[PDB]
């Protein structure tokens, strides 16, 4: 199992002045890229969504929804504020078999339109990294999508490892 090496953090920007309250709400995953992300053609990835909710202890209750096989699959997650506003670790790791690492980095966002988030984790000892292009709506500008493509590449990902989930109306509305 061969993988493209996770980029060195110094290459992953952090959203200047992150506002955890404004980043709340529903986000559409309009762009996906990772060393474990492949541009399938016989069955293109469907768009799923992720809802971020602040807890009073300032942690996020991240829950996602995807339409898998005639149903909505929901998966919960708790992000815990890291060392700098915008960074996050995984709450209750250890309740996730094979997980020794997990990190989130809000690269950039305008809180109303879009956002770019970098994730990196170590499962089974294999290092995985990915980047989601978030959209407040199910679609966005070409400017934003090529910016996403540009960044993914700066991290070592070939076009091939960059995909745009096709918009759907099931479960993510
Ligand atoms: C974060 O999620 C937890 C559960 O994931 C929410 O806890 C719920 O809290 C209410 C009121 O205290 C309870 O009635 C529910 O039973 C709890 N749910 C669970 C699964 O334990 C919590 O409210 C969330 N916080 C926000 C602001 O969304």
Swiss-Prot record:
Glycosylation sites: 61
Residues reported in the UniProt entry to bind a carboxymycobactin: 48-50, 121, 130, 134
Gene3D superfamilies: 2.40.128.20
Residues that hold enterobactin according to the record: 102, 130
Keyword terms: Apoptosis, Cytoplasmic vesicle, Disulfide bond, Glycoprotein, Immunity, Innate immunity, Ion transport, Iron, Iron transport, Pyrrolidone carboxylic acid, Secreted, Signal, Transport
UniProt induction comment: Expression is activated by the oncoprotein BCR-ABL; BCR-ABL misregulates expression via the JAK/STAT pathway and binding of STAT5A to the promoter. Induced by insulin.
PROSITE patterns: LIPOCALIN
GO molecular function, one term: iron ion binding
Record's keyword annotation contains Transcription: no
Tissue specificity field: Detected in neutrophils (at protein level). Expressed in bone marrow and in tissues that are prone to exposure to microorganism. High expression is found in bone marrow as well as in uterus, prostate, salivary gland, stomach, appendix, colon, trachea and lung. Expressed in the medullary tubules of the kidney. Not found in the small intestine or peripheral blood leukocytes.
Cystine bridges: 72-171
Taxonomic superkingdom: Eukaryota
One Gene Ontology cellular component: extracellular region
Pfam families registered for this protein in UniProt: Lipocalin
Effect seen on changing residue 121 to A: Strongly reduced affinity for catecholate-type ferric siderophores
Transmembrane feature ranges: none
GO biological process: acute-phase response; cellular response to amyloid-beta; cellular response to hydrogen peroxide; cellular response to hypoxia; cellular response to increased oxygen levels; cellular response to interleukin-1; cellular response to interleukin-6; cellular response to lipopolysaccharide
Family: Belongs to the calycin superfamily. Lipocalin family.
Function summary: Iron-trafficking protein involved in multiple processes such as apoptosis, innate immunity and renal development. Binds iron through association with 2,3-dihydroxybenzoic acid (2,3-DHBA), a siderophore that shares structural similarities with bacterial enterobactin, and delivers or removes iron from the cell, depending on the context. Iron-bound form (holo-24p3) is internalized following binding to the SLC22A17 (24p3R) receptor, leading to release of iron and subsequent increase of intracellular iron concentration.
PANTHER family: LIPOCALIN (PTHR11430), NEUTROPHIL GELATINASE-ASSOCIATED LIPOCALIN (PTHR11430:SF13)
Protein name: Neutrophil gelatinase-associated lipocalin
Organism, scientific name: Homo sapiens (Human)
Gene label: LCN2
